[PDB]
Amino acid sequence: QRVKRLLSITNDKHDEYLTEMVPLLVEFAKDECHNPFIDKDGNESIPSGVLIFVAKAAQFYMTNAGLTGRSMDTVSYNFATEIPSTILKKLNPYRKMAR
């Protein structure tokens, strides 16, 4: 139905692999704002809108460029200059938004 194509990939196979790439982007890039993307144990935290970003950003990037990439499927990561340009504005809308 094509609906399965979203969850049959980097959800059912890799919900833990694509989603972690993005709190390297959301937590590093947001560290700028000083806002609570951190939890009470000192672990990672992500809200609802920035969550649609973590999943859709990395299911676009990992499913495309871990393979049709050419710069390796696990490396000293590109997250700082990669993960698609348009969704990168969805990194920010929760708290602070800029500084």
Hey, where are the domains in the chain? Answer: 1-99
Residue 95's identity, in one-letter code, is: R
Q: Which residues are paired to 38 by β-bridges? A: 44
How many CB atoms sit inside 10 A of residue 56's CB?
17
Residue-wise DSSP of 42-82: S-B---HHHHHHHHHHHHHHHHHHTTS-SS-SSSS--TTT-
Determine the Cα–Cα distance for residues 41 and 71; give it in Å rounded to an integer.
34
Determine the Cα–Cα distance for residues 74 and 41; give it in Å rounded to an integer.
27
Phi and psi torsions of 63, nearest 5°: -70, -25
Domain 1-99 falls in which CATH fold? Serum Albumin; Chain A, Domain 1 (1.10.246)
- Name the experimental technique: NMR
